[PDB]
Design a protein around this ligand. Sequence first.
Ligand SMILES: Nc1cnc2ccccc2c1
Ligand SMILES: Nc1cnc2ccccc2c1
Ligand SMILES: Nc1cnc2ccccc2c1
Ligand SMILES: Nc1cnc2ccccc2c1
Lengths: 268, 269
Amino acid sequence: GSLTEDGLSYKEKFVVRSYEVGSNKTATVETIANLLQEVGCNHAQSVGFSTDGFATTTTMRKLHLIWVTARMHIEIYKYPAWGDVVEIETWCQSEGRIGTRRDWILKDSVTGEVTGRATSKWVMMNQDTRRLQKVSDDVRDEYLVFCPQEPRLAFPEENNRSLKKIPKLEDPAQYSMIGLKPRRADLDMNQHVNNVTYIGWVLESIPQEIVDTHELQVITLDYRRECQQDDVVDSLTTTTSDSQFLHLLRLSGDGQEINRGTTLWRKK
Amino acid sequence: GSLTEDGLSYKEKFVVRSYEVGSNKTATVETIANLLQEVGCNHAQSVGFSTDGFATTTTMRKLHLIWVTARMHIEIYKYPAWGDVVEIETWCQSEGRIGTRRDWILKDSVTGEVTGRATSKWVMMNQDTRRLQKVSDDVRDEYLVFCPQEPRLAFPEENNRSLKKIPKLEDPAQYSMIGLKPRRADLDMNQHVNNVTYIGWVLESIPQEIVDTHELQVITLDYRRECQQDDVVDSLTTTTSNDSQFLHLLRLSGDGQEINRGTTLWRKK
Ligand SMILES: Nc1cnc2ccccc2c1
Ligand SMILES: Nc1cnc2ccccc2c1
Ligand SMILES: Nc1cnc2ccccc2c1
Ligand SMILES: Nc1cnc2ccccc2c1
């Protein structure tokens, strides 16, 4: 792909592959999430940041500081069929001392219509202590020149689905998938579990009949803790209602929370 | 991509993606196997066959007959780095009434050098009864016009690694990864476990130290039985050997029913 005319956003076109589609011959939400991650990487490379998924500056590298996803929000109107070309436009925006935001717009290359949109909140943390730091003055001036100065939101709606608090699921869960482990294909270049894997694990506890009669429209996911290579996960789901669900990912042993989220599904 | 000038082979270029690489900053063998599957699907579409992974004709669809992988053989000399463009050329060849063969050649787009090669054996079977059958003349004549008439082998060698019999691993296995289950991302459009998942499951029992100090050079995998969506798998490995060789076994964690058997060859980095 390439940076747009103003150098404040990045665009890339993707053809949907045969192994990237589900039972309804269209891309899965995990395929979409992978393409957003890929276009975010190419945007970070096109302007000089690191490309390991942390988008760091030389200053951030010296201080052992990385960017970590705290929240992901995805809304899909139409999943592209295999062979279809999808165009994704992405940009970053500063959210003061709290962190950074990356937004995406998905379009049909042939019609030009918006078929999806995503937003994500990123926080700064020490890679070793796993702490959390306010965006310091020195670090923000290094990335602000690559962000639009006026607000540019994929989800502009005054107080919408991406800014609501997610509650903690109470036991007993209605549905569950237990004993979920990552394999080497679930790890990234830094040997950490890929963020898309957690989306897949959340969806493992959705009953088969929902998957067979409904299409996933919205997904909001909070990232509270990372699952290590040798950890085992339990995926929990309860219907809160269209069909809505509350989700919970937690360590199979102690029940330590790793993720919490919500999904909205539409009848086919 | 596109069919070549003679319409007897297909070529496609792929850029390596950020999520497609491993710890060495290069594509994994599972990424490669996925790209071979993708280029095979585009070749089947470019000449009118089905695109569900079974590459069927109207005659085969009428008889509930599909093509299934019996063996996969992959040899990688250089794994492409992310951002690198890899060009894959694929073609089919008839192997009499036994079945068909699909071959691949992987190249560096910039240098033009061969960085890998693969071969696979496919058998014809009834979708429902799961019973294999020898290719009839009516079925053979429908695909022969899309195959080179002279033999065209990715592995031409007098006695090569892709035609050797794989023995059954004996208990106790040296290494093992137990309780492996497929998720929805491991299923294809027909809700069957993707063939690349079995390659990943085989490699789950290779010790971390080998993965950290060696690079996978050769992998030969036999597909004896399919793992169902609700099945659990056990992955077993024993060292059989500057190079490291292993014997592999995938089997159902319950009854110990065999699903796959294979061999891997690794070279020191
Ligand atoms: N409607 C969809 C889309 N993508 C999915 C991805 C993983 C699991 C279930 C899904 C259902
Ligand atoms: N805080 C950041 C991080 N990475 C970026 C990559 C491209 C453009 C703007 C960015 C801002
Ligand atoms: N050297 C390699 C290449 N690809 C792999 C894929 C899956 C697991 C281990 C691997 C090791
Ligand atoms: N037996 C088959 C199946 N699919 C093919 C696709 C393209 C060219 C030749 C083929 C032969």
